[PDB]
Amino acid sequence: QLTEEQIAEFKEAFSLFDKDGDGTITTKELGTVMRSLGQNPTEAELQDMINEVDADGNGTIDFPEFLTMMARKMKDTDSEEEIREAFRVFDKDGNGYISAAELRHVMTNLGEKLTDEEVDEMIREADIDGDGQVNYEGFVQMMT
């Protein structure tokens, strides 16, 4: 599954959050990284991020937990269905299809609000037939 090189890239990634070098990542370490990227998280966002990765419950992330997260095969890990169920929220027919225009509205104007450039790539890769109706079950497979 994991190369010796993948684990090494992951260890270098872990080092960039573990500034003090104690071998754990605290919520305050993660907030410093995120603000360096121009993000402005709140303490609760950072806690939500940490709680999804922390496996023992201490409120900090060590390298085994970080590696477990980074190596979780987010593809077959029952994730395909939750993204389908997500797409089905906006499929008002059962069509398995969603208009490119409807998709751009939902993607640009709700949730995380993507850029128009980003919604171009998404629509372009996902409209296999190029007529303005994407079938999301094929797009799901492509992301995984």
Binding site: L37, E52, V53, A86, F87, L110, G111, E112, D120
Partner: protein, 65 residues
């Protein structure tokens, strides 16, 4: 009315941002306006954060179901 809509969009948006970031010439890299020259150490932290944000959006979607 239907709190499932924001969580649904966010799950898709995070899943795609996580997928697109594997291509290092994706337009998704243009969103960090506040960084002058995107270096490779930015990209390693950005991919960790995006993975972390996808797992949170997964969680909040399941919670609204």
């Amino acid at each position: 009315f239907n709190r499932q809509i924001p969580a649904a969009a966010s799950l898709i948006q995070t899943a795609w941002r996580c997928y697109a970031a594997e291509n290092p010439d994706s337009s998704t890299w243009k969103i960090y306006i506040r960084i002058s020259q995107l270096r490779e150490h930015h990209r390693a932290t950005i991919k960790v954060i995006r993975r972390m944000q996808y797992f949170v959006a997964k969680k909040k979607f399941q919670q609204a179901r």
